[PDB]
């Protein structure tokens, strides 16, 4: 069955709440597994302590940066980057979980959660999950964003793991 992961989100360290995600391992196993393992930290690096550094109201919340030797921008569990697995799933509405990238076949650790349908990203970003619980928390996060994405307070992943 598809795995579920959670983030406990904080705002300048003050707990906001939990967002849980279903990861579509049945459709994008490699991409789901990357996010899953980064969420548990089992490879020795991952999302715990990272921030949502780009939050654009009415669009998406992006995070997944963390420090490693050749960068501060995060990396996958397969070495630095990996290929776009497939584009089966679309950015159909709020709660979609999808990979950030720097063009084709540049998936690392960065991801975003859509707060709206973003169909212009279909075929450009690999959708691999969706918000299960805590969409209210994502909406709360969104209110700390801005039009250029800069956040007005530090939105962090205080804890994360697998449910």
């Amino acid at each position: 069955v598809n795995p579920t992961v959670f983030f406990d989100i904080a705002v300048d360290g003050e707990p906001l709440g939990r967002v849980s995600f279903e990861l579509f391992a049945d459709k994008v196993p490699k991409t789901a597994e990357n996010f899953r393992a980064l969420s548990t930290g089992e490879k020795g690096f991952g999302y715990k302590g990272s921030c949502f550094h780009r939050i654009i109201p009415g669009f998406m919340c992006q995070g997944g940066n963390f420090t490693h030797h050749n960068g501060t921008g995060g990396k996958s569990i397969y070495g630095e980057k990996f290929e776009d697995e497939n584009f089966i799933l679309k950015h159909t509405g709020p709660g979609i979980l999808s990979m950030a990238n720097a063009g084709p076949n540049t998936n690392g650790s960065q991801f975003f959660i859509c707060t709206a349908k973003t169909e212009w990203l279909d075929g450009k970003h690999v959708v691999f999950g969706k918000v299960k619980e805590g969409m209210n928390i994502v909406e709360a996060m969104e209110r700390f964003g801005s039009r250029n994405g800069k956040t007005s307070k530090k939105i962090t992943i205080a804890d994360c793991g697998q449910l």
């Binding site: 780009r54 669009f59 992006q62 999808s98 212009w120 990203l121 994405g149």
Partner: peptide, 6 residues
Amino acid sequence: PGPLPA
């Protein structure tokens, strides 16, 4: 830059 807004 992050996913494009359009």
